[PDB]
Design a protein around this nucleic acid. Structure first.
Ligand SMILES: Nc1ncnc2c1ncn2[C@@H]1O[C@H](COP(=O)(O)OP(=O)(O)OP(O)(O)=S)[C@@H](O)[C@H]1O
Ligand SMILES: [Mg+2]
Length: 1173
DNA sequence: CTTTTTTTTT
């Protein structure tokens, strides 16, 4: 019988425990956030304080306060749904330890000497918390009575194979032998759980819906903990990040928490380590054949229609542009035919193409691959011509098909949300977006006959249940992604190819920002929450720019209060605590004697390693160093009399697979144990599985009931963060070496932490993915593009690394390339600081603490430069000891990031401008493309220099060391990867206001009123965000010349009309004067300089204009120049001729560059020329 | 030249 909430009626909710400074840090920031933003808006609050200061105890006390607030709210409401609280972390052990810590807090919390909650209140509060493990673990913890009750209650017993499967599972349960049986039991438990829940859900969705209550309800709630969430019995969930990204099950469907994040509270512990976890999920997506997908979309969108019912209101207007695009794409690329390759170098190896989707494009083909349609053969052939043919490239087709596919998935998201709006105002049970999502997708795909995209629609919603590439939007790798396309022959046939494409549509930082934008309030708890790496942490410069004030910050008063709290509870210096740090090299001569004593019947230790320990010849140069620093640390710890607890953090786990090595290590320990008269217990293979099966409490039990030393062998992946290695202290076994460092004792029990640590250098710091080859390729390209996006890599180095990655470089060559970045050193120092923070859990410390660190870490630790006010005592001592050698000359990270980000922004601008011009030079043009081109021109004219970091045209500007001007070198029509900027080029072209001659131009009497009326800037602000060289040379000066010419001509009574999109961008604008039947076009330039306007180009422009518009006149005028030069008259072939026959009039200048005086003579000549037509 | 373990569904 459930506990009623009416037991909290007499509870006094206004009596609360004393809030610590950490509690005030969370509460004041969240209350202020609600004051500033809305009540429904999301937030992200990182809490980057010292390790061991008590940030999980504070997160669980904040969760308990949220549960009490919810109980109070529903007590007064005596309908509002429960607000969901999530506790997420990477490791299962930290999930179960935090749940047991919250339950312990509920059990034995005290207020003024009396328990805060009665036993019935405690049982209700505990009933509000659930834990959601993997499906095999969920099934294996259900007793036979529960599962037989579930099978009986759903009439699932008599269904053939299901009972056959269940009878097998219970059999394996009864005789659970050594782990050999257990791996099989786990695999079959997970498969049976999936099948059973699938049939339970299909039974609950149909008309034969079973009524759940009493025993049946308690059993199904035991089998399905998410059924408690769906009912409303519980609203607190403890789970991992993988489970949170996958979702859980109830009796109806699978609940995805990412689709229902509005109003939720997420507590993410060790948030930085979740960056890689989310990444490993994004790389699991399934590849899609783009040729089949686009041919299916074209075939089914041709005629199929939606219903004209109210529930499908204004959904077809979402899909009409996609239908027009599909019909145009299929006409252009001849999608009636299939695709095949031909020629050499195309059959031996498949073709691989990589695209950033903005400006990084790498092809595995030596020559550019073309695409031609053979109407006699009825085939599309991927040729390699041995002779730029812009029309008919394979990369153009692949990019346009990826654009169309992502357009279809985006319009599916838009139409599902529109369906849910139509339903909520029509259907008038689950009336939310998450509950209507499956029916909306099913109805739309069934109506369009596109049910084969159903899985694709679901996963795209899974990745993008929280939600462009235009130089007018904010651009970033984190919301666009990357794409990897493989073109290979179809499996089974020898005459067709397919384009399997794998996409990353967002980065982990984009997912986190989408989560905050959806309305979630997220508490990010980690000491390394603000590490300066983008591989082992989120990009917080991107998150700061995107979230704005939703990224809650902590004032210096609050940080000083937290620092005072930490230094008050960790007073090492006043209490006589001394910690010694040793940087241990490789002592081969010391390992030679120990190896000789181990097996004294052999002469050469090479034979001992090669035969007994099982180490080959490729090793024995590496193993002899990590099995020598480890032994020197263990010997130095055993020689220490007072120290009792040692932890050794390596990169590899010492388990049965390395049993022979353990035999050597155990022998060495026993040799030392008898020499110094101490008892030593060694714990090997302490990994996640050992923690689930055996449990870390055994180590603590050993330290509590037995005297002697203990050495533990774990890794960074198991004990690096979150783990709370503690043991109960009995003064009889601890001697007299323990002392309290807190000024005021704050602990009920007596506990101590590790007193000796050995820290290896972390090794495999570039992330990898063993799921498949495609997943590892996506993870490597994501890490290269994140390093290019941050600024740690120049665009040419990232392009070269992406080319070597497409060519198939080795993991050791990726690791070599990553070791040259400062990201690697910030990741190394983040891992070291987190690992060293495992020895600072309690206030009962040994008088001496021994730290033994790999000597191959000293130079890295020597380059710490952050504020030491946030470090812990062990990390401050590690840094001070490594720094004791002094300071080494290093390059400032900000100056190199500025050089890289200037190169990046300039290359992005060049590629985007070229693609914009290509789209403009296409018949017919587009309204959006013209609008975007105009928006760029007006923005650069109005704001040629901005003060704050731009949020819409961020790629038009670079940040310079000078103010309002900078120097550069590079060919504007050459390689974007060869540009140099700032101080690297002391002599080079300048991007400055005076170089543009703006002041001389505006001195004209007609320029100022036109500029001021239009709002354009007449001067350059002195700010550090200046235009890139491409924007300055190509776009800004052209618009400035065109605007000056139009201003003076309009002052001379010239009316202007918009150029039609058929011939857009080919000429500046129209010309109408006094009324002439013949059309007149105008082309305007800023100054004379050099112009790629040879006779062939002019003839092409005239032919393309006169073809669709007949004969016409043409004016070609330079805005600035010498008025002494004579006005010219040239024919259509740019040849001097008589005025009576010439079709083109040329004006050398319209505004003088010496006094800014208008050319009245030129206007009079133009008047006479026009009147003489 | 570098030198792995971790969660989940399948
Ligand atoms: N004010 C407090 N009262 C009682 N116990 C506390 C208090 N603060 C912390 N503790 C306990 O002391 C230890 C501090 O550990 P946590 O609170 O887990 O540390 P942390 O600061 O979160 O460090 P992390 O998670 O490794 S980076 C835990 O065992 C807490 O349960
Ligand atoms: Mg924690």
């Amino acid at each position: 019988m459930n506990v009623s909430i009416e037991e909290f009626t007499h509870f006094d909710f206004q009596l609360v425990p004393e809030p610590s400074p950490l509690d005030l840090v969370i509460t004041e920031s969240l209350k202020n956030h609600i004051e500033v933003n809305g009540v429904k808006s999301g937030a992200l609050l990182p809490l980057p304080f010292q390790t061991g200061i008590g940030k999980t105890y504070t997160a669980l006390n904040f969760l308990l306060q949220q549960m009490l607030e919810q109980v109070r709210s529903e007590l007064k409401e005596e309908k509002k749904s429960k607000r969901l609280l999530y506790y997420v972390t990477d490791s299962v052990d930290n999930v179960v330890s935090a749940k047991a810590d919250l339950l312990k807090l509920i059990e034995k919390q005290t207020v003024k000497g009396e328990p805060r909650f009665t036993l019935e209140q405690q049982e209700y509060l505990k009933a509000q918390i659930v834990h959601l493990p993997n499906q095999s673990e969920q099934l294996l913890q259900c007793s036979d009575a529960v599962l037989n009750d579930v099978l009986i209650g759903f009439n699932l017993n008599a269904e053939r194979d299901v009972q056959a499967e269940w009878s097998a599972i219970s059999g394996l349960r009864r005789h659970a032998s050594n782990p050999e049986v257990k791996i099989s039991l786990n695999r079959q438990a997970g498969y049976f759980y999936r099948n059973l829940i699938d049939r339970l859900q299909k039974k609950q969705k149909g008309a034969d819906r079973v009524l759940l209550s009493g025993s049946l309800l308690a059993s199904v709630e035991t089998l399905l903990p998410g059924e408690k969430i769906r009912n409303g019995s519980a609203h607190v969930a403890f789970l991992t990040t993988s489970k949170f990204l996958k979702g859980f099950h109830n009796t109806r469907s699978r609940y995805s928490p990412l689709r229902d994040l509005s109003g939720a509270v997420l507590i993410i512990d060790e948030i930085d380590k979740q960056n890689q976890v989310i990444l490993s999920e994004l790389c699991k997506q399934q590849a899609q054949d783009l040729i089949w997908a686009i041919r299916t979309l074209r075939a089914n969108f041709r005629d199929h229609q939606l219903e004209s019912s109210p529930r499908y209101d204004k959904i077809e207007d979402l899909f009409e542009p996609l239908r027009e695009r599909l019909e145009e794409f299929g006409t252009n690329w001849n999608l009636a035919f299939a695709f095949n390759t031909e020629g050499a170098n195309l059959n031996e190896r498949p073709v691989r193409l990589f695209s950033d989707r903005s400006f990084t494009h790498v092809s595995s083909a030596t020559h550019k691959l073309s695409l031609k349609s053979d109407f006699l053969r009825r085939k599309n052939l991927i040729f390699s011509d041995e002779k730029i043919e812009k029309h008919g490239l394979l990369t153009r087709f692949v990019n346009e098909a990826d654009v169309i596919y992502q357009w279809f998935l985006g319009t599916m998201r838009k139409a599902v949300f529109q369906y849910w709006e139509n339903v909520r105002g029509l259907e008038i049970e689950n009336r939310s977006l998450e509950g209507t999502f499956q029916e909306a997708v099913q109805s739309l795909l069934t109506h369009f006959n596109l049910q084969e995209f159903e899985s694709a629609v679901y996963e795209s919603f899974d990745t993008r249940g929280l939600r462009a590439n235009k130089l007018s939007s904010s651009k970033s790798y984190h919301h666009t992604g990357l794409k990897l396309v493989e073109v290979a022959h179809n499996q089974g046939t020898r005459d067709t190819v397919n384009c399997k494409a794998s996409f990353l549509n967002t980065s982990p930082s984009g997912v986190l920002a989408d989560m905050v934008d959806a309305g979630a309030v997220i508490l990010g708890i980690s000491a390394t929450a603000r590490a300066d790496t983008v591989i082992h942490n989120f990009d917080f410069k991107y998150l700061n720019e995107r979230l704005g004030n939703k990224l809650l910050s902590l004032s210096r008063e609050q940080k000083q209060r937290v620092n005072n709290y930490y230094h008050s509870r960790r007073n090492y210096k006043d209490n006589g605590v001394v910690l010694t740090v040793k940087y241990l090299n490789s002592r081969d001569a010391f390992l030679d004697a120990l190896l000789e004593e181990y097996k004294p019947e052999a002469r050469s230790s090479h034979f001992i390693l090669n035969h007994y320990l099982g180490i080959a010849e490729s090793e024995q140069a590496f193993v002899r160093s990590w099995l020598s620093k480890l032994l020197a640390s263990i010997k130095a710890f055993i020689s220490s009399p007072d120290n009792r607890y040692m932890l050794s953090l390596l990169n590899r786990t010492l388990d049965t697979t390395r049993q022979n090595i353990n035999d050597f290590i155990q022998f060495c320990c026993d040799k030392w144990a008898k020499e110094f008269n101490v008892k030593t217990k060694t714990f090997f293979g302490v990994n996640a599985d050992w923690m689930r099966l055996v449990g870390y409490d055994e180590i603590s039990k050993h330290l509590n009931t037995e005297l002697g030393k203990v050495v533990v062998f774990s890794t960074y992946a198991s004990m690096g963060a979150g783990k709370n290695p503690d043991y109960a202290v009995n003064l009889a076994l601890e001697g007299e070496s323990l002392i309290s460092v807190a000024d005021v004792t704050y602990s009920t029990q007596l506990r101590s932490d590790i007193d000796s640590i050995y820290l290896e250098k972390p090794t495999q710091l570039l992330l990898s993915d063993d799921y498949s080859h495609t997943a590892n390729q996506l993870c490597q390209f994501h890490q290269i593009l994140s390093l290019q996006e941050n600024g740690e890599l120049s665009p040419k180095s990232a392009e070269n690394w992406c080319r070597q990655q497409l060519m198939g470089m080795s993991r050791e060559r990726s690791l070599q390339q990553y070791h040259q970045t400062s990201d690697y050193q910030s990741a190394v120092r983040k891992y070291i600081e987190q690992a060293v923070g495992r020895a600072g859990r309690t206030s009962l410390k040994r008088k001496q603490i021994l730290l033994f660190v790999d000597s191959g870490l000293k130079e890295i630790l020597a380059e710490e430069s952050r504020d030491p006010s946030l470090f812990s005592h062990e990390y401050v001592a590690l840094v001070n000891k490594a720094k004791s050698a002094g300071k080494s000359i290093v390059e400032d990270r900000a100056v190199r990031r500025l050089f890289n980000l200037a190169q990046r922004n300039n290359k992005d601008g060049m590629l985007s401008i070229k693609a914009l011009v290509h789209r403009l030079h296409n018949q017919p043009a587009s309204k959006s493309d013209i609008q975007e081109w105009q928006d760029i021109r007006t923005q650069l004219l109005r704001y040629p220099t901005v003060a704050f970091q731009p949020e819409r045209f961020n790629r038009l500007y670079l940040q310079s060391m000078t103010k309002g001007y900078y120097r550069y070198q590079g060919n504007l029509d050459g390689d974007p990867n060869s540009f140099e900027f700032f101080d690297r080029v002391p002599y080079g072209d300048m991007v400055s206001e005076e170089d543009c001659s703006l002041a001389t131009l505006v001195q004209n009497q007609y320029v100022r009123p036109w500029f001021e009326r239009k709002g354009f800037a007449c001067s350059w602000q002195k700010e550090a965000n200046v235009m890139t060289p491409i924007m300055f040379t190509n776009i800004y000066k052209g618009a400035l010349g065109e605007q000056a010419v139009e201003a003076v001509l309009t002052a001379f009574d010239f009316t202007f009309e918009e150029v039609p999109n058929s011939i857009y961008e080919r000429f500046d604008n129209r010309v109408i004067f006094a009324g002439i039947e013949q059309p007149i076009w105008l082309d305007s330039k800023y100054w004379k300089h050099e112009g790629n306007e040879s006779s062939e180009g002019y003839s092409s422009k005239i032919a393309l204009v006169e073809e669709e518009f007949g004969p016409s006149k043409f004016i070609y005028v330079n805005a600035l120049g010498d008025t002494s030069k004579p006005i010219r008259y040239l024919n259509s072939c740019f040849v001097e001729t008589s005025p009576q026959l010439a079709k083109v009039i040329e004006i050398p200048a319209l505004i003088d560059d010496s006094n800014a005086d208008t050319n009245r003579t030129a206007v009079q000549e133009l008047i006479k020329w026009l009147h003489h037509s």
